[PDB]
């Protein structure tokens, strides 16, 4: 609920930060730059959802809530700006491999039971090309 509310623009729109001192792009957005610390000047930066599979795994026995999705692809995607993210990939388990170009998609990531909040966010999909 409250935690969902804070990182919505990140999960929904992939909005990270850019350090002008470095030039480096960070996602998720950081409050303190790991290199420059207080010196780093931060501006909000909108990432494109485009990225490539850096590594991946297929989850065969997940929590009871992911029963419909089983087996699913979890992966670490290297985005074209540089940041890496962990997310699921909507594709057949035989079609996934390292280096596959993917694109972020707005999906229903979770729900807090029958009565709680629904949590949306990014899930990657392979590009048509």
């Amino acid at each position: 609920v409250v935690r969902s509310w804070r990182h919505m623009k990140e999960r929904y729109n992939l909005i990270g930060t850019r350090c002008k001192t470095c030039g480096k792009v960070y996602f998720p957005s950081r409050t303190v730059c790991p290199d420059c610390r207080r010196k780093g000047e931060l501006e909000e930066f909108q990432l494109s959802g485009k990225g490539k599979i850096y590594t991946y795994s297929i989850v065969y026995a997940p929590p009871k809530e992911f029963n419909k999705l089983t087996p699913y692809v979890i992966a670490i995607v290297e985005l074209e700006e540089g940041p890496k993210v962990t997310a699921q990939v909507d594709c057949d388990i035989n079609k996934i491999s390292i280096g596959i170009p993917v694109e972020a998609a707005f999906r229903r990531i979770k729900e807090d039971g029958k009565d709680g909040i629904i949590s949306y966010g990014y899930k990657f999909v392979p590009i048509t090309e």
Binding site: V1, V2, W5, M8, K114, D115, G116
Partner: protein, 347 residues
């Protein structure tokens, strides 16, 4: 100048239940609740009443004040959190019940307690664009609070209806402008399955209700180039009297400016009827040339702001239908047992 209210109407069911009657059952101190929430009692619909009937009563009263043939109404919108059907529309029943059918458009609106005013804006657009001559917007609800919960002290039944027109000779009030502030916020919600809602507790206040109400109030006053001193009366969303007053005081409104708008202490929270009912009571008392600020609020996070000016034609119409305050004082008290019976809170 182009767009304005030509008629307004309201309805409140007769049954009430005092805070004391609810607290008694749940082992709470009534005076603590009353002081805390700024609420004394609330409206209870009869078992043969619902959001549709309430909407119809209010719609019919608005037509009386407008003094126009309902065949001229080109759109009916009903904003509620408690539409009787999940699929069949309330607005279609209200249209049939006022004989506006069949040459019109309609839709049922959902946006927590902001749904009623959402439709006012829709009617403003359609009349202003010339797509229709008159539009009706209704905000009505038969709210249900969870038996053990605090929302049980406020959740109540009521509705008010507004007819929007283009004719200076028929306008009793004029829209100077509208503004809306909307975000995605999980402060309060109800999932399709559940009969009673779930809330985030203290997260509902500052980060949601105040954030959206005050931003919308500041946005409209920025849009109009206006200050708190320019407005004669104000009405805000009133989940309880506490929130309403804090917001009014925060913006710099005095009791004389906000008193007419605040009905919750003796009516409760009618959700989508709340601000519409408040505004209707302001219009029952208002004089020519009075400027009103009206700001609504909806969970999931939205607020609609209005800047309205009252016209010469106001006193002509007030007595054409029942005054909000008269409906509010024609009442019959019930105990909790009868209340749970009426509400179908019985298993």
């Amino acid at each position: 100048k182009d767009i304005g209210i030509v008629g307004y109407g309201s309805y409140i069911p007769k049954y009430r239940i005092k805070v004391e009657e609810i607290a008694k059952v749940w082992g709470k101190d009534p005076e603590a609740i009353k002081k805390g929430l700024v609420v004394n009692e609330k409206s209870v619909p009869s078992p043969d009443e619902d959001t549709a009937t309430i909407a119809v009563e209010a719609a019919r009263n608005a037509v009386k004040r407008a003094g126009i043939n309902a065949e001229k109404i080109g759109a009916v919108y009903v904003g509620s959190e408690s539409h009787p059907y999940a699929v069949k529309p309330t607005s279609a029943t209200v249209a049939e019940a006022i004989g506006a059918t069949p040459d019109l458009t309609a839709a049922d609106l959902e946006f927590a307690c902001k749904a009623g005013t959402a439709g006012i804006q829709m009617c403003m657009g359609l009349v202003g664009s010339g797509l229709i001559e008159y539009g009706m917007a209704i905000g009505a609800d038969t709210a249900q609070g969870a038996p053990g919960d605090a929302l049980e002290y406020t959740a109540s039944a009521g509705g008010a209806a507004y007819i929007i027109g283009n004719k200076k000779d028929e306008m009793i009030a004029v829209f100077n402008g509208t503004y809306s502030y909307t975000t995605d916020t999980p402060d309060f919600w109800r999932r399709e399955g559940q009969s009673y809602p779930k809330h985030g507790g203290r997260f509902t206040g500052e980060p949601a209700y105040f954030k959206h109400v005050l931003n919308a109030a500041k946005g409209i006053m920025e849009k109009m180039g206006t200050t708190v001193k320019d407005y004669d009366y104000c009405v805000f969303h009133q989940p309880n009297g506490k929130f309403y007053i804090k917001a009014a005081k925060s913006l710099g409104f005095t009791n004389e400016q906000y008193k007419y708008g605040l009905l919750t202490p003796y009516l409760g929270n009618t959700y989508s009827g709340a601000v519409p009912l408040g505004l209707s009571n302001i219009l029952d008392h208002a004089e020519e040339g009075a400027r009103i600020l009206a700001v609504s609020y909806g969970s999931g996070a939205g607020s609609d702001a209005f800047d309205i000016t009252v016209t010469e034609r106001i006193k002509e119409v007030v007595d054409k239908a029942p005054k909000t305050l008269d409906l509010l004082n024609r009442k019959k008290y019930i105990d909790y047992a009868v209340y749970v019976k009426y509400r179908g809170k019985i298993k």
